[PDB]
Amino acid sequence: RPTLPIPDLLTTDARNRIQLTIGAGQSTFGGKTATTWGYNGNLLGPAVKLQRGKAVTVDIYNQLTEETTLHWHGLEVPGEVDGGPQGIIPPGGKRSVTLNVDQPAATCWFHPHQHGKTGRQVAMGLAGLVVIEDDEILKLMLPKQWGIDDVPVIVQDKKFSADGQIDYQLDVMTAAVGWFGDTLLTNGAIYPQHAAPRGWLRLRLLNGCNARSLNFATSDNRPLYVIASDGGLLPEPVKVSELPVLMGERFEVLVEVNDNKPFDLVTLPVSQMGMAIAPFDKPHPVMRIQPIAISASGALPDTLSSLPALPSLEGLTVRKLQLSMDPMLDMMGMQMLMEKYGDQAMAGMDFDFHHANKINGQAFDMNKPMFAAAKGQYERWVISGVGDMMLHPFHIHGTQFRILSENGKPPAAHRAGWKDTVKVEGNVSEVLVKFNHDAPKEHAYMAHCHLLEHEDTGMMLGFTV
Ligand SMILES: [Cu+2]
Ligand SMILES: [Cu+2]
């Protein structure tokens, strides 16, 4: 196996600046070359490291021949630096943003948010990481050797043309069910291996797929200790045998490397339209873990953090957000899916498409924020997928929120801490959300489905603070 590539840990320079160059290059998948995009590279990006309470200025150089934006998914920052569809960086141009980090330690990420082209731009290779650190987390003695026992794991699927190029399309099928492929990448590589010291291994898992949900496990069924979610440390570790991860969600887990036998991190088949088509109809290797006898001292603490209590529900503003899809889109999309793949496309399951996906009866309008949310006050947002059968990992910019109910039930323990994404699929979810920073109509916050093709075809709204 190839060794697992490790995104460079990128810190501020002497003048508190960081440089990111967005550019086209070449990558190789199964010996066949593909044009790919990356941040400071051919593909994917670095891990930008940030400290709570410390400002940094990021200089962003768009070296593509098309417009793009740069969104910091998970970051509690004003709209002005949030990099939504309004944050155009012109081809060949430079834009600088100041990030004043004021949130708990977490693994966040960044990616484009170009109007109607987010799916393509992510599919082409653009994604990076954000490692936020604070006073508190460094006291825990968690594994911390970057790329040795503290390893990022960005898992993505791609579809390739016969000639080896990435095969991306926003068409009627993918507008309905999302863009998905038959090849799995782990930090850009096909089934790589990582050499992990005996003791404890920390994986910072990111589901960077456009539309594919994942469910992580190990090949020999050893447990995963979930220590962190989108927005940071849980109160204490949650021990699981498997870990579902929605598009754009991050979890950090520890895995015990307690002997010398190699094992795989795998993803288990999911029940989501399109996603159980072979070879994802069976458990699928993500990466091979090879135990090695080199120095490590990371540990699993009993107690990780203390989070605030859920706010009292009494008197909070409630906002309804009804997710919907044009029924003509669902029919045609599911029709083209069967025409392409056949029966397996429905395993586990019991006309201008460009504006067919909606929230509150409206496809995204960049010039029309849907509402003004309060600043510094909890609100209760109620997001409903009643009426359609698709999966909608619902993401809200400018915040880390608490899940009160997820798609019918109180959240699983490992999902009860800080989240920026909530599952919506045929039912209704509730979040307790607070915005610590402002966003004017000219640089509004987004709230949207993170199934990228849904977002690109209207399942997004803007809101101010
Ligand atoms: Cu985001
Ligand atoms: Cu959706």
UniProtKB/Swiss-Prot annotation:
List of residues binding Cu cation 2: 73, 111, 450
Induction: By CueR, in response to increasing copper concentrations.
Domain Plastocyanin-like: 25-135, 197-262, 351-465
Lineage: superkingdom: Bacteria
InterPro entries in alphabetical order: Cu-oxidase-like_N, Cu-oxidase_2nd, Cu-oxidase_C, Cu-oxidase_fam, Cu_oxidase_Cu_BS, Cupredoxin, TAT_signal
Cofactor, free-text remark: Binds 4 Cu cations per monomer. Contains a mononuclear type 1 (T1) or 'blue' copper site, and a trinuclear copper center consisting of one type 2 (T2) or 'normal' copper site, and two type 3 (T3) or 'binuclear' copper sites.
Principal cellular location given in the protein's record: periplasm
Binding site for Cu cation 1: 71, 395
Post-translational modification: Exported by the Tat system. The position of the signal peptide cleavage has been experimentally proven.
Cell compartments where the protein resides: Periplasm
Residues engaged in binding Cu cation 3: 113, 397, 448
UniProt EC number: 1.16.3.4
pH-dependence of activity, as noted: Optimum pH is 6.5 with 2,6-DMP as substrate. The pH dependence of the reaction as monitored by oxygen consumption shows a broad activity peak between pH 5 and 6 and a second activity peak at pH 8.
Family assignment from sequence similarity: Belongs to the multicopper oxidase family.
Protein name: Multicopper oxidase CueO
The encoding gene: cueO
